[PDB]
Paper text:
Here, the effects of radiation damage on the conformational landscapes of three different proteins (T. danielli thaumatin, hen egg-white lysozyme and human cyclo­philin A) at room (278 K) and cryogenic (100 K) temperatures are investigated. Crystals of these proteins diffract to high resolution, which makes it possible to fit alternate conformations. Here, the conformational ensembles of three proteins subjected to increasing doses of radiation were examined for signs of damage at 100 K and 278 K. We found that crystal structures respond differently to increasing dose at these temperatures. At both temperatures the conformational heterogeneity (in terms of the number of alternative conformations) of the crystal structures is at most minimally affected by dose.
Residue numbers in the entry: 2 to 165
Write the structure that this text describes.
Amino acid sequence: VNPTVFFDIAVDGEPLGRVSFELFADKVPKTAENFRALSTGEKGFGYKGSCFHRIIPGFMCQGGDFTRHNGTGGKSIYGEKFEDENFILKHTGPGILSMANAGPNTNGSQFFICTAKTEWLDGKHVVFGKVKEGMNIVEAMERFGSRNGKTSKKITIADCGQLE
């Protein structure tokens, strides 16, 4: 019953591949629903065409700022940054999908995909999904990041939506 969504990734406009995610609506419904709705674009805005603006190899790939494209923007589907739903799920290794934020109860649209275990983030960032297929595509993306997070090529969500 948990929804599956996909991102089709491009690198400087060239197709790279598809990453799919299981979203844990059973455990974090409000947080899963935000991401799913942003991924389909059914509210009139969302992830399609946005970039991964911060990528640090061995740590994580961050995206979801579809409004300012640099980590200063993004918005939820709810009309105003939302609460940390719960911290049931932990940052237990590569593939974990988690909400970026600006402190307690400030969730918008930005997220990260872990490429390692990042337990120091437990209790600070709401984990709400996990890569189901295409972790190799995330690994290929990661190689275009750098120590300070700046990417050396433009990493884009060329298309996205819900699978079934």
